[model samples]
Target: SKIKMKVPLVEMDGDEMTRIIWRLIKENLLEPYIELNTEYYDLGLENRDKTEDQVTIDAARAIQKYGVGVKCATITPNAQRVEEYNLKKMWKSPNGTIRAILDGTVFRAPIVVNSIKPFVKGWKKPISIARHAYGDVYKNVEYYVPSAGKAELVFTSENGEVSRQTIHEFDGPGVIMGMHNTDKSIRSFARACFNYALDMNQDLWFSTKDTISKTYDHRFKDIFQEIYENEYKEKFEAKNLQYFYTLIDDAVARIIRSEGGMVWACKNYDGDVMSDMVASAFGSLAMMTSVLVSPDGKYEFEAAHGTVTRHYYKHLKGEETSTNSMATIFAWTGALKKRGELDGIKELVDFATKLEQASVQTIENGVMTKDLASLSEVPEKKIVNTEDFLKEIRKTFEGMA
Candidate 1:
């Protein structure tokens, strides 16, 4: 019997192999179980280029209006990608654009199954990473200097009160980069991190190189401190959790040493690198789940890994590819779970919970994709290709029924 949904999910589709599996997941796992109400938007590269990327904007708007979205990994184009796809110029990262529209932060957590163990022996709980994604290196402008010259960050007011900061005085030809951020976005990011930590009942660790970039990075530290002291201090204390700030290097060393169970908030670039490292350390990148939470807690879920184009190519060649779909599957379940909560549908919630549990149990019971078979420590192993792996999960799900 299908569980009826009260509201439609904003389904923002993506590209490559994940796209192929997206439909499979729906047909095999989702369609049989629920009347999937979805406001579908095709965010494929060709569609994005064809729609002049309006589809991406429309999808984000739908998320804002409906308060839930499940997105696939879309291509963030570069010169190589532009040539490869015959794109109209290079497209801005869909993730970045959507995050900006939502005024949100991304939180990534590993899906720790019973059989798959972390490389870090101390990890008992998942280390959630909340990345401050707006206004950093991703948004920075860069310049190539052919000869020795000055690099300055300059601003001139309408009243001619010029403000100039010397970025560098190059002795020889070099390169320079400039970036900016707003107090508003930083505050929003901070609030979102604190709120998420409280919701998870986890200690919060915010990291930045404040000692070096006294003004630039320290601004982040100061904003977090000010927000914590004024707004979140009482709530954090009541929740029996603490918020700590440290230099990024020290934070990294400490993270390596401590047992994982905290929300680590990072500046944009640092979070990008650390989250990938954390996910890989936990087992496989395909086992990490990601969510974009707006300051007010509007949600969008997605897999942490990008589209498995390598595996897709193999599938296209009519060869079996054992790509892991755990994260992408979890993305759908996350959205469904959230939707169920919002709509007060116990059946929807139960289905999502059981679906996730079945996936983990399937892996624990020795049925796994090739990637997990090599990495997982399951005692009984039945290594299977992608399709069979999903079917195994479906079998487990039916048993739960």
Candidate 2:
């Protein structure tokens, strides 16, 4: 059975700074390489409006058909954006919508290399975070305490059954509340994280603060343990990766002090805080590459950062905009590299790696966009214009010494 050397790719469009950079990347990088077979879709705002955003659904389906997708930054509007763009009822984030349909966990990691400097001096490698982006704090009931009283939770089934549960009693002034996660979403998040750990071939570290809210919090811990013991124990051992669990407090300090290259899973809230801290430590959001991986293992690569609309407008006025496109570039390379791996095309895989390396080399040589800023630590101040920066990478990649 012969295998195809080139893997098929599906590209989802985006907005603003990224939208501009996407065209440049296609012209300068993707199109020049005859080896790539890509399918493109316009995920732009106008197109989304025209299709009533049904196109995003089609994009997800296409990714499923091909097994990989590379997306660009898009708008997630608020009231102001709703007014500014005259959006139809302020649509949910395209990424969020895609993620819900795809049922995936998003992994965000800095693109660390020998050349690109990091904010954390101790960082010699990148610490990647796989965020379980469902339920808990992201979607919860929250409030402040006004009077001293006991906190209680009540649930009623459709059959007219009543169950009252006590949360906590306040001595003078305090507060307690309730939130819920369906067994379905939690199970999916767990599976996705486990799958990612196996794929990365790294240990999976997870934790929960069950001591504080034993029943509510412990459910999460119990679910994870149950899944591991029942479904993944043998595979975890086979892969030489341990699924480490501890109390949340202990795990937080331990995870950071430990080296990188492991999957550290946290509940929605813990992950929300920790992932940002990790991102800041790693360096620029411009360098943070992200991918949404379905529970079933399909991937849609993207940059964690939003579109730089301010820069985009400047770019529109014919001003030189130094918008960083590293994350966007990796969006292509990561998906293609993974595709090559899946299809057993070593040359294609190697080429993807070379392209990534050239990307790093380009940054190392002080040929990057404005977002990266002048590398004060690096002695070379050879800043090139945005287009020239990418062009240099293309030239260097073609063995143009």
Candidate 3:
């Protein structure tokens, strides 16, 4: 008796609104793709609460072991969310917690088209922002400079080894601060961002406030530069992309004014701040996409939006819902597309392309989700609703029949 072979899998981490689409993918999209072996883990709020968030850790571990994962949007509770969700202890973002255990960075890339205008019109192609998502302001101890002296960060290993570092020694009044990172983490971040850009055959752009922070920001800039010069330079140039370096502020200006088609590498703090700006300026949050990249080249893809609890509320009330599923659908097609690239499966890649093309062509045909309706500028025709738009895609793709 012959045994069946295991198909290359797409691991799933379920979330809110995205959770809804995940089911639809398994049903409407995936069931037809015979011979697919899928690995799934439910990561909704309820599941996380039921298991006390152990599942998140397990899912991250699985991704690390398997080299690929696809996720949906999950909530990271704050005070309001804690009360709303009504849980035991306040939970951190599952993504951040997973990053802590997995030791990788998250980079967000926007899917672009000639028709959909970005606020930054200068961007001709897509530009991705790979945020370091680890330290800095996101994890810092900051306070006012009282009277004035020095702000020292003292570190003693549990074994009584001493390592004292002074962040700043101020003489007058101003803000004083302290920050720390394991060399292990920053190096991992640099390697991951560079590896991703090179693998994708795209140019890499990075910047630092070296002029101001000297050792602090300069350390990051210097580290990536040194790594490029030493390890990644040849491979980077081989992909026809030369690594470019500049001051952070200058890079920001250039990115805003120029047409896109490169990756802007950012530190964790910058990722938190700048990614929002980048996503918002692109107009439709529903259309935004997110990816988590481990330093080892493992990738997890997801939609950038949230669970749509409000939309769920409306849905429950028997009210019509127009929840956009583009980002989540992209999670499916994008991962398949990337999987094709990684595994050298040309047919899979071609199928992924057809899926994406169908989506855009649906939009060009004046059929789109409600969120995109507001963003569409053409006077050619009005945008249709969610179910109708999806029908347009199915109908159009069915033309081959």
Candidate 4:
């Protein structure tokens, strides 16, 4: 008897190895345990191109409607991919589009198995990175100056009072870029980070380059501080967790030296670079699980890494591949658990918990894919191909039941 769901999770399908693994997970892991309800959207590169990217927008809106989403790893096309896939035009990243529609903060954490040691020896627990995703240089306008010229940032008031700030005076050909964000977005980011940290029972550490960009970056710092003091400070104190704010450089130095067990919140640019660095330092990027949390309490779960194109090619050649599917598996569990919480489904929540345990237990028991086997500390490691590894986890899962 399968557990039934009252509400559907919005499911976004993608491309390559992860998409193939998506189907495998459903059939082998989920369908037998639950009547998996999802409002599905195919966000594959071909589908996005065919739908002129409207499907991506619709999918995001559907997530908004449903309040929960589970996404597969997707291709963000480059020139090579453009030609290879015969795309109509290069589509923007589906993740970026969905995040924009949701106005969310992306929180990433490395999935740590007991047998695998993080590069940072001091890390007793996983460090989570919460990236403010709404605006930054990512959503900026850039223009190349043909010759030396003046660049200015100008603002006009409603009554026509003009304020101009000199950006730069170039002596040679150069580039000028303009970027913007709102106080509303920053506040939402702060709230999401704080809420997520409180929920996880982790200390929150937010960093910005405020010492340098006093006005622009400091706004982020100030907003976070204000939000913490005015709203979340008491809650944090009650949980015996601290909310620490500092400069980005100092935060980086401190992070490397300290035991990792806090939620590190960063502004857009800083988080963009730091999350990848943190994930790589912990293990393979394939070990990172990501979730986007909106101020409105919506969530979208996905693997932090890209679609494994190289492994996909190997799979195409009729050769067995040892791709790490841990993050992808966690993505499903994260969404399902959140859905269970919302619907008050104890059985569903228990299944998600057991599924995650089985996955980690499989690794600890010396059965793992090549990526984890290479990084694991298990003395008698048995590396298996993707299919076999999932089967190994299934065996453990059934045993637990």
TM-score for each of the candidates: 0.94, 0.80, 0.81, 0.93
Instruction: Judge candidate 1 against the unseen true structure and give its global Cα lDDT, from 0 to 1.
Output: 0.90
- Candidate 2 residue-wise lDDT at 306: 74
Cα RMSD to native, each candidate?
2.0, 5.1, 4.7, 2.1
Which residues of candidate 1, in runs, are more than 4 Å off?
Answer: 145-150, 157-160, 169-174
lDDT of 3 by residue, 124-144 (tens): 777788888576655566788
Model 4 score (lDDT): 0.90
After the best TM-score superposition of candidate 2, give how far the Cα of residue 106 lies from its true spot, in angstroms.
2.0
Rank order by TM-score, top first? 1, 4, 3, 2
lDDT of 4 by residue, 1-401 (tens): 99899899999998999998988888888998899999989999999999999999999999999899999999998899999989999788888788878887999998888878888778878999999878777677778988888999889998979999999998899888999889999999999899999989989999888889889899998999999999999998998999998888999999999889999998877877888888888987878889998888899999888789999999999999998788889999999999999999998899999999999899999998887766788899899998888888899999997
For residues 141-185, could you state the per-residue lDDT of candidate 2 as single tens digits?
Answer: 656677778777889999999998787776766656567767787
What Cα-based lDDT does every candidate model obtain?
A: 0.90, 0.77, 0.72, 0.90
| Winner by lDDT between candidate 3 and candidate 2 | 2
Against the true structure, candidate 3 has what lDDT?
A: 0.72
Cα deviation of 267, candidate 2, in Å: 3.7
Runs off by more than 4 Å, candidate 3: 1-10, 133-152, 157-179, 198-202, 211-214, 232-242, 313-318, 338-347
